[PDB]
Each structure stands twice: as structure tokens, then as C-alpha cells.
Design a binder for this molecule. Structure first.
Ligand SMILES: [Zn+2]
Lengths: 57, 42
């Protein structure tokens, strides 16, 4: 999918440097960020199920 | 669009701290749901 080009809206602290970043078109829900337990949107539970094209970090 | 955000970089980099702080509270009021108006020195 396309990644929109823009600054991150919520900077966690004051003075955080604004940087042009790759961004999802819609902010992912907090349940979609977690890996071990899936959510209603995606039922994957590990990086094998997600099937990332690139190597992880 | 690469020619459009080239000035967004130049504007967001030169904003004063008073503008950065003002942009922080207003954004939070937007997130918590309070009206952004009414926010607007010793
Ligand atoms: Zn989810």
C-alpha cells in the first residue's frame, strides 16, 4: 500500500524535531501494533504470519 | 507534491518556540476532543 509523506502529528515531547517521514494513510489502532496477540483486523500472531518482505529490526 | 512540502520544511523549521508550544496544546485539545478555539504574556 502507499505510504503518505508527512510529519508525525503527535510528538511525544516538546522540542522534538519535526522530520518528513513515511506515514500510514490512517493511524493504526493500538491493537494492530501488537504482535503476540492479534486483533479484529488482523489475526496474525508472529512475523512469520505477517510475511514481511524485508528483514526485521 | 515534492515541490509543495519543500516550503513546509522551510516553515516548520523556522517556527518560534511560542508557535511550537501553541501548536502542542491545540493539537492535544483536538485529540482529547475539546474545541481548539478559546486558547488565545506576563
Ligand atoms: Zn487492529
Amino acid at each position: 500500500v502507499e505510504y503518505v509523506k508527512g510529519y508525525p502529528p503527535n510528538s511525544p515531547y516538546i522540542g522534538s524535531s519535526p522530520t518528513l517521514c513515511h506515514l500510514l494513510p490512517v493511524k493504526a489502532p493500538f491493537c494492530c501494533l501488537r504482535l503476540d496477540k492479534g486483533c479484529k483486523h488482523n489475526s496474525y500472531e508472529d512475523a512469520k504470519a505477517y510475511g514481511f518482505k524485508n528483514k526485521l529490526i | 507534491a515534492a515541490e509543495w512540502i519543500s516550503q513546509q520544511r522551510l516553515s516548520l523549521y523556522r517556527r518560534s518556540e511560542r508557535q511550537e508550544l501553541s501548536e502542542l496544546v491545540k493539537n492535544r485539545m483536538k485529540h482529547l476532543g475539546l474545541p481548539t478555539t478559546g486558547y488565545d504574556h506576563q
